[PDB]
Amino acid sequence: TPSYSLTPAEASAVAELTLELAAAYGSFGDPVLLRDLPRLAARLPEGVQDFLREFKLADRHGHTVIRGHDFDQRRIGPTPDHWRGRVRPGPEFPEELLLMLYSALLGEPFGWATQQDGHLVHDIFPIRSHEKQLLTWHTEDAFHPYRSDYLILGALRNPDHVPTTVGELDLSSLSAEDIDVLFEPRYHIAPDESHLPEAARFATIQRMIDERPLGPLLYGSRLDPYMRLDPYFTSVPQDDTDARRAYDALFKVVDSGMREVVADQGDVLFIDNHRAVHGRLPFQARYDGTDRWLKRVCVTSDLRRSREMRATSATRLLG
Amino acid sequence: TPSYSLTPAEASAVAELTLELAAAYGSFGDPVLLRDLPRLAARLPEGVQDFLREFKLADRHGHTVIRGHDFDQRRIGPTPDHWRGRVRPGPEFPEELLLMLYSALLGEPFGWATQQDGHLVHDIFPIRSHENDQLGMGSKQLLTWHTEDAFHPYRSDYLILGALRNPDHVPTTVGELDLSSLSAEDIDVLFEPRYHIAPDESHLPKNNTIATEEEAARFATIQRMIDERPLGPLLYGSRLDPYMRLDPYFTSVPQDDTDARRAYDALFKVVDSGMREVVADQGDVLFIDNHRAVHGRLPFQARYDGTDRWLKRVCVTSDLRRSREMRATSATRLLG
Ligand SMILES: N=C(N)NCCCC[C@H](N)C(=O)O
Ligand SMILES: [Fe+3]
Structure with a gap:
């Protein structure tokens, strides 16, 4: 499985761009940021653009990882209690934007209007409300005609190195x-x-x-x-x-081929929803603010294909 | 219906960019070029990028035009007698690259394996032996309007037509749904x-x-x-x-x-009476939404003397992987 390890210089350029963008746009609620995503993504290190483009076009691997990003743990702040009612964007805006840039390189960001208030970037953290475990794996929304083409999982933190499962077809x-x-x-x-x-x-x-x-x-x-x-x-x-x-x-064949892949702090895991299934592994969560924290963006290759289920022409949210 | 007119400064920068890229890459057969397209397209004037992004995202108008490109006639040379047997790429390679850059702003360029040897940018000019046919390579016959490949589940999402020359200002017909x-x-x-x-x-x-x-x-x-x-x-x-x-x-x-x-x-x-004549003159690039517009072309008399109307055409898909079943390898952009 191909992977890309950023140099300190790349990691610094990515962090810098990420902060500069977070300061020039209000939120994803801003129409122009969404307009500008591909042009803006062209400002990332060329090696990173090239790498992701080759992954997309190769159409050969179920997942890939870009590793060694610089996610400012002090700035990002403590892992929150819940997503609901929480003010957006939080201090971790920079990292959300990063995943959005990566999404525009792959296709278009989209979400589900019911899911997590229909935020284009989804939170993955332990919750005491929605708390013998069955180790399941799947295609995301396998039933749905307009299901994700790609998933992007950015690990803000993973102190206990809790892996993700991902499997392909042999x-x-x-x-x-x-x-x-x-x-x-x-x-x-x-x-x-x-x-x-x-x-x-x-x-x-x-x-x-x-x-x-x-x-x-x-x-x-x-x-x-x-x-x-x-x-x-x-x-x-x-x-x-x-x-x-x-x-x-x-x-x-699929079940027996499953691999554990850890998304450690600074990693961004890219899942091809047509070539790989993925899953969760159970873990003991602390609830103190130091818990594992990923962000997740759903990518569609063809936004217009889902027009019938979208409210207006402009919205990236289905349902 | 919105369009974009290039300033002379913008036209110069576009021309310079396409000349640079023409020298830097060998042909469209180079896989790295196809890979680099979207990043290369980000070097186009920002106005142009924003304009096309807005056309794409708005998903409302059925066509748009970018006018006022500088297509150097001396460098481009005579309109060929045939698409077969030509040195590839020809002297008009910079213009072909231009359309490929534009295609990468809209989606992904693709082709049909049986159409002009699978060339991703194809030619539209009169061929004498084709005079009696209803095609792009004809002239005397009326090309009646239609959605391109209406039947096909993997038909084009967009078409990009670039007019290298059009001495007698022969219009393209395009129609939308009121x-x-x-x-x-x-x-x-x-x-x-x-x-x-x-x-x-x-x-x-x-x-x-x-x-x-x-x-x-x-x-x-x-x-x-x-x-x-x-x-x-x-x-x-x-x-x-x-x-x-x-x-x-x-x-x-x-x-x-x-x-x-x-x-x-x-x-x-409704569609037949909404039909508009849109002239793509020298230096015009026409963008057709295959899901919102029909298009056709008027009959004209060809001269077959190297001075004929000459357009380049690129088909665009919003999702190359959708047609995977009809493509030989994962890497190929050719259907069939
Ligand atoms: N065929 C090959 N290898 N071409 C590489 C040149 C691409 C460099 C790029 N146009 C730039 O100026 O940044
Ligand atoms: Fe899942």
């Missing part, structure tokens, strides 16, 4: 018969809850919500397939014995 | 899967090969569209400001669907 482990079955629309993938704590928009998912169209698991190249796998919310018709058999073999 | 001109009932019908859109012959899996497992799977989605003839909408996206895919020549309205037939005739009438 084809040589599967027969040509199983693969062919997996390409066919013979599988149900259920949605997700995310409800409670606008009709023409809503009645769109209703094609999956009422009729429930069977979709494939593998698509793209047949020699190097993409995947959408969420074993927890996946269903197969009982009478489709071929499909169930091919689903078992696919699970067994 | 939604206020249609009934709410017609719109609802046009949003419904009630229309059959046939592929252009170039896209036929029996037309191009095929033979071997690998090449067969690359056309399996198209073959299945040919076998099952699914019906689809002519309008999609947002009901208040819809995208369209309209190719009158390849659209079949089912005989028994009276509602669809009424709405299609309504849609056709």
Whole structure:
């Protein structure tokens, strides 16, 4: 797995640009910052731009990491209690912007209007409210036609080095018969809850919500397939014995290939949502303000493709 | 409809940039050039970048033009007799690079493997032996308007047309959808899967090969569209400001669907009467949203003497990975 380790000079240039941008724009609520993202991202170290572009275009690895960023722990401040009601942007604005720049290099930043007040940058930290653990892994929103193309996870802090799980597909482990079955629309993938704590928009998912169209698991190249796998919310018709058999073999290959990848402080992990599944590992959280803290941006290659489910032309938020 | 006119200073800087890049890279066959495109495009005048970003994000107008480029006629040379058998890249390489930079501001340049040897920037100029055909390489025949590759799930999102020369000022026709001109009932019908859109012959899996497992799977989605003839909408996206895919020549309205037939005739009438003539003269670059505009071209008499109208064209996708099933390798930008 290709990775990029920034020099102190690169790390300094990235930190500097990050602070200069945070001082010139109010928030992501600012329309012009969103406009300017790609032009602004062209001000990053050329080596960093080149690296990410090669990852995107190679379309070969499920994940990559840019390491050795300088995240000012004093400035960033203590890991907060909750995301809700919290004033945005916080002191860690610089780092959020960084992930936004990285997102514009990859595609476009987007979010879910219900998820975390619909903030384009998502918080990942322990919460006592939403607190024997089952080690699960998945494609992000595997059911959804407009699911992420890429995920960017920036580790602000990770004092106990709690890894992330990420796994890819090994084809040589599967027969040509199983693969062919997996390409066919013979599988149900259920949605997700995310409800409670606008009709023409809503009645769109209703094609999956009422009729429930069977979709494939593998698509793209047949020699190097993409995947959408969420074993927890996946269903197969009982009478489709071929499909169930091919689903078992696919699970067994992916499950056994899972790797632990640590996003330590200063790391930014890039997950290709079409080539890799990811997951959480359980950990003992302190709640004192020193807890592991990641930020997360969802990237779409094609914003306009989701227009039917977006409120207006301008909004990057779905639903 | 917004456009951008370059100051002479801006035109000079663009020209200088494209000359520099022309010397620094060998050809579009160089993978590093394709990689570098978006970063290189950030060296364009900031006004231009902002303008095109705003066109892209606004997602409202169906075309725009950037006017007033300096395309050096002496360096560019005579309009060729044919696209086959030319030294690649030619003396007009700086202009091709320009369009590639613009494509990277909008999305990703891509092509069709069967079209002009898979060249990402293709030529539009009269070819004598092609005089009797309805194509870009023709002249005498009217190129009637349409969405490019209406049938194809991976058709262009944008088209970039750059006029190297146009001595007789032959306009391009482009048309948009005035939604206020249609009934709410017609719109609802046009949003419904009630229309059959046939592929252009170039896209036929029996037309191009095929033979071997690998090449067969690359056309399996198209073959299945040919076998099952699914019906689809002519309008999609947002009901208040819809995208369209309209190719009158390849659209079949089912005989028994009276509602669809009424709405299609309504849609056709609006678009046909909204048709605008837009002249891309020397130094003009035309941007067409393939989801909001139709385009065509007027007939003209070619001279075949090296002085003919000459346009360069780039197709743009907003998502190269969507067409992965139809591309040979991960790296290729060629479909088929
Ligand atoms: N074919 C190769 N290797 N070209 C490298 C030159 C790119 C340098 C870039 N245009 C610049 O001036 O920064
Ligand atoms: Fe997840």
